[PDB]
Amino acid sequence: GIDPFTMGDPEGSFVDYQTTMVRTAKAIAVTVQEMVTKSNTSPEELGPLANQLTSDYGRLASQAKPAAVAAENEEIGAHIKHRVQELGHGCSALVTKAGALQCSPSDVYTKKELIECARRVSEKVSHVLAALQAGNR
Secondary structure: OOOOOOOOOOOOOHHHHHHHHHHHHHHHHHHHHHHHOOOOOOOOOOOHHHHHHHHHHHHHHHHHHHHHHHOHHHHHHHHHHHHHHHHHHHHHHHHHHHHHHOOOOOOOHHHHHHHHHHHHHHHHHHHHHHHHHHOOO
Protein backbone atom coordinates (compact mmCIF):
# COMPACT_ATOMS: atom_id res chain seq x y z
CA GLY A 1 0.00 0.00 0.00
CA ILE A 2 2.45 2.61 -1.26
CA ASP A 3 5.90 1.74 0.03
CA PRO A 4 9.30 3.28 -0.90
CA PHE A 5 10.14 0.12 -2.84
CA THR A 6 7.03 -0.12 -5.02
CA MET A 7 6.89 3.67 -5.29
CA GLY A 8 9.94 5.43 -3.93
CA ASP A 9 10.95 9.07 -3.90
CA PRO A 10 14.30 10.50 -5.13
CA GLU A 11 15.27 11.85 -1.70
CA GLY A 12 13.62 8.74 -0.27
CA SER A 13 16.86 6.85 -0.74
CA PHE A 14 18.94 9.67 0.72
CA VAL A 15 17.30 8.96 4.08
CA ASP A 16 19.63 5.98 4.57
CA TYR A 17 22.81 7.73 3.44
CA GLN A 18 21.86 10.68 5.62
CA THR A 19 21.20 8.63 8.74
CA THR A 20 24.21 6.37 8.26
CA MET A 21 26.86 9.09 8.06
CA VAL A 22 25.26 11.28 10.74
CA ARG A 23 25.65 8.31 13.10
CA THR A 24 29.34 8.34 12.27
CA ALA A 25 29.46 12.13 12.62
CA LYS A 26 27.89 11.83 16.08
CA ALA A 27 30.35 9.04 16.86
CA ILE A 28 33.20 11.33 15.86
CA ALA A 29 31.68 14.14 17.93
CA VAL A 30 31.66 11.97 21.05
CA THR A 31 35.17 10.64 20.31
CA VAL A 32 36.59 14.17 20.13
CA GLN A 33 34.55 14.91 23.20
CA GLU A 34 36.26 11.98 24.93
CA MET A 35 39.61 13.30 23.69
CA VAL A 36 39.22 16.51 25.71
CA THR A 37 37.88 14.56 28.68
CA LYS A 38 40.57 11.87 28.69
CA SER A 39 43.46 14.31 28.19
CA ASN A 40 42.97 15.48 31.78
CA THR A 41 44.32 12.28 33.30
CA SER A 42 44.76 9.99 30.31
CA PRO A 43 47.09 10.81 27.43
CA GLU A 44 47.44 7.13 26.44
CA GLU A 45 43.67 6.67 26.11
CA LEU A 46 44.13 9.19 23.31
CA GLY A 47 45.96 6.56 21.29
CA PRO A 48 42.86 4.46 20.48
CA LEU A 49 40.82 7.68 20.29
CA ALA A 50 43.05 9.14 17.57
CA ASN A 51 42.79 5.88 15.63
CA GLN A 52 39.06 5.88 16.32
CA LEU A 53 38.56 9.36 14.89
CA THR A 54 40.79 8.46 11.94
CA SER A 55 38.82 5.27 11.26
CA ASP A 56 35.28 6.66 11.42
CA TYR A 57 36.24 9.79 9.47
CA GLY A 58 37.05 7.48 6.56
CA ARG A 59 33.54 6.05 6.75
CA LEU A 60 31.90 9.48 7.03
CA ALA A 61 33.90 10.83 4.09
CA SER A 62 33.08 7.67 2.16
CA GLN A 63 29.32 7.92 2.59
CA ALA A 64 29.67 11.45 1.28
CA LYS A 65 29.92 9.87 -2.17
CA PRO A 66 26.64 7.82 -2.33
CA ALA A 67 24.82 10.54 -0.38
CA ALA A 68 25.76 13.29 -2.82
CA VAL A 69 24.37 11.35 -5.75
CA ALA A 70 21.25 10.57 -3.72
CA ALA A 71 20.52 14.09 -2.52
CA GLU A 72 17.99 15.69 -4.86
CA ASN A 73 19.06 19.15 -3.75
CA GLU A 74 22.27 20.68 -5.10
CA GLU A 75 23.27 22.41 -1.89
CA ILE A 76 22.54 19.42 0.31
CA GLY A 77 24.65 17.16 -1.89
CA ALA A 78 27.38 19.79 -2.22
CA HIS A 79 27.63 20.64 1.48
CA ILE A 80 28.09 16.93 2.21
CA LYS A 81 31.45 16.80 0.43
CA HIS A 82 32.44 20.27 1.62
CA ARG A 83 32.01 19.50 5.32
CA VAL A 84 33.89 16.19 5.16
CA GLN A 85 36.51 18.04 3.11
CA GLU A 86 36.94 20.48 5.98
CA LEU A 87 36.79 17.62 8.50
CA GLY A 88 39.62 15.87 6.67
CA HIS A 89 41.83 18.77 7.67
CA GLY A 90 40.45 19.25 11.17
CA CYS A 91 40.36 15.59 12.17
CA SER A 92 43.91 15.10 10.93
CA ALA A 93 44.97 18.15 12.94
CA LEU A 94 43.21 16.81 16.03
CA VAL A 95 44.69 13.30 15.87
CA THR A 96 48.14 14.83 15.40
CA LYS A 97 47.79 16.90 18.58
CA ALA A 98 46.25 13.91 20.34
CA GLY A 99 49.28 11.84 19.39
CA ALA A 100 51.59 14.64 20.49
CA LEU A 101 50.02 14.95 23.96
CA GLN A 102 50.05 11.19 23.98
CA CYS A 103 53.83 11.55 23.92
CA SER A 104 54.09 14.58 26.22
CA PRO A 105 51.20 14.84 28.74
CA SER A 106 53.14 17.46 30.70
CA ASP A 107 52.80 19.93 27.81
CA VAL A 108 49.69 22.05 28.25
CA TYR A 109 49.83 23.71 24.82
CA THR A 110 49.64 20.38 23.02
CA LYS A 111 46.50 19.65 25.01
CA LYS A 112 45.14 23.18 24.46
CA GLU A 113 45.39 22.56 20.71
CA LEU A 114 43.30 19.42 21.06
CA ILE A 115 40.70 21.20 23.21
CA GLU A 116 40.39 24.03 20.68
CA CYS A 117 40.19 21.47 17.88
CA ALA A 118 37.62 19.07 19.36
CA ARG A 119 34.98 21.76 19.96
CA ARG A 120 35.42 22.88 16.35
CA VAL A 121 35.22 19.47 14.72
CA SER A 122 32.15 18.66 16.84
CA GLU A 123 30.63 21.64 15.03
CA LYS A 124 32.01 20.58 11.68
CA VAL A 125 30.46 17.13 12.16
CA SER A 126 27.24 18.92 13.08
CA HIS A 127 27.45 20.62 9.70
CA VAL A 128 27.15 17.17 8.10
CA LEU A 129 24.13 16.63 10.34
CA ALA A 130 22.67 19.99 9.32
CA ALA A 131 23.48 19.70 5.60
CA LEU A 132 21.82 16.31 5.37
CA GLN A 133 18.78 17.30 7.41
CA ALA A 134 18.18 20.31 5.17
CA GLY A 135 15.32 18.29 3.71
CA ASN A 136 13.86 18.16 7.22
CA ARG A 137 12.69 14.59 7.75
